[PDB]
Design a protein around this ligand. Structure first.
Ligand SMILES: CC(=O)N[C@H]1[C@@H](OP(=O)(O)O)O[C@H](CO)[C@@H](O)[C@@H]1O
Ligand SMILES: [Ca+2]
Ligand SMILES: [Ca+2]
Length: 117
């Protein structure tokens, strides 16, 4: 099961992984990391973070061009919800808090894995 918005479904099994291991888990499940593209999608992800009591990865990262956060397509963000002062070792990946706000993090951080389908 999971939380859905339109045709998109977010799911978690409570796994906690680094960014690379999280990406591999979602891809092997034939999805991808949570990529909220709207307020409504962000709120669905946030509900799951609050339930699990653990910040989650989003898919987006700036590994290609520093400060330009992109999806796995390489396209620039169409929506963001940065915490105050964010984006503030390098922090190339993105976590979502239980208040729904985002923070850039080192990609070695171990976070909740939420996939989208
Ligand atoms: C690993 C991690 O999440 N670090 C966070 C965290 O860093 P500090 O070590 O607590 O200053 O809070 C910062 C905001 O004050 C945030 O920008 C940063 O990404
Ligand atoms: Ca960065
Ligand atoms: Ca940060």
């Amino acid at each position: 099961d999971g939380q859905a918005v339109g045709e998109k479904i977010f799911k978690t099994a409570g796994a906690v992984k680094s960014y690379s291991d999280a990406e591999q888990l979602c891809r092997e499940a034939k999805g991808q990391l949570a990529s909220p593209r709207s307020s409504a999608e962000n709120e669905a992800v946030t509900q799951m973070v609050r339930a699990q009591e653990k910040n989650a990865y989003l898919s987006m990262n700036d590994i290609s061009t520093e400060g330009r956060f992109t999806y796995p397509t390489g396209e620039i963000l169409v929506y963001s919800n940065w915490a105050d002062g964010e984006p503030n070792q390098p922090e190339n990946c993105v976590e979502i808090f239980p208040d729904g706000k985002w923070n850039d993090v080192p990609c070695s951080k171990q976070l909740l894995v939420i996939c989208e389908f």
